[PDB]
Structures are given as structure tokens and as C-alpha cells.
Amino acid sequence: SMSVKKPKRDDSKDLALCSMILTEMETHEDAWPFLLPVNLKLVPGYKKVIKKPMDFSTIREKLSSGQYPNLETFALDVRLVFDNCETFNEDDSDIGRAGHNMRKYFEKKWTDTFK
Known part of the structure; x- marks a missing residue:
């Protein structure tokens, strides 16, 4: 609440780490249905x-x-x-x-990187 905060989790690497996850999803062999918007x-x-x-x-x-x-x-x-x-x-x-x-691939990377 006001002037009462939980200790600050370091989020300074989140951008880089989400980028890396997304790179790994992009390069998975089963990514082909998801690479581009559906026409x-x-x-x-x-x-x-x-x-x-x-x-x-x-x-x-x-x-x-x-x-x-x-x-x-x-x-x-x-x-x-x-x-x-x-x-x-x-x-x-x-x-x-x-x-x-x-x-499945995503959820494991997500848990291992952030939980």
C-alpha cells in the first residue's frame, strides 16, 4: 500500500530474456504455423x-x-x-x-527462466 512495498524483483534483464525465448520459439521446427499472421x-x-x-x-x-x-x-x-x-x-x-x-516448449522455458 502507500509507502509499503515488497522487496524490488530485478526486472532489468526481462526484455533480453523474453527476446531469447522468442528466438527459440521462432527457430523450433514446429513454428511454421505461427511465424506470420494468418492471411x-x-x-x-x-x-x-x-x-x-x-x-x-x-x-x-x-x-x-x-x-x-x-x-x-x-x-x-x-x-x-x-x-x-x-x-x-x-x-x-x-x-x-x-x-x-x-x-509445452514455451511453458517450460518460461518456468525455467522466470520461476
Whole structure:
């Protein structure tokens, strides 16, 4: 509360560390469905159904331009990428499996880097 604060967690490396995680997600072999925004002119139903499209290139641009206020807003966009994927793709599809694999990969890096 006013003049009463928990000890200051060092967040000075968060930007660099989120960048490194995102590099590792970008270079994973199952990243291909997530590298670029879904083409809303060419994928029937996507625009209406997926209210907040997100992809790795959009996260990279947001990260590089200071549009994440803190490391949690960064994790929320990464998770959005996989939540969107689950919303639109059957579990038993290449893209559906890709999304589950990448979410697992992300969550482990996230825990090991920050928890």
C-alpha cells in the first residue's frame, strides 16, 4: 500500500530474456504455423471467429518497439497464439499438434527462466 512495498524483483534483464525465448520459439521446427499472421483474405472464417489474431512476427515487432509493459503481457500474447490455434484447428491435425507442442516448449522455458 502507500509507502509499503515488497522487496524490488530485478526486472532489468526481462526484455533480453523474453527476446531469447522468442528466438527459440521462432527457430523450433514446429513454428511454421505461427511465424506470420494468418492471411484473413485467404482463410475463410478466421476473421470472424478469431477476435484477436496473434503470431510470432507481431510479438517480435511489439517486443522490439516497447509495446510490452512487463513480462506478463508478453506471456499473454504468446499464449494467445496457442489459444487461437486450438480454437480453429482440430487436435488431430498437423497444425493442431504443432500448437500443443509449442505451448509445452514455451511453458517450460518460461518456468525455467522466470520461476
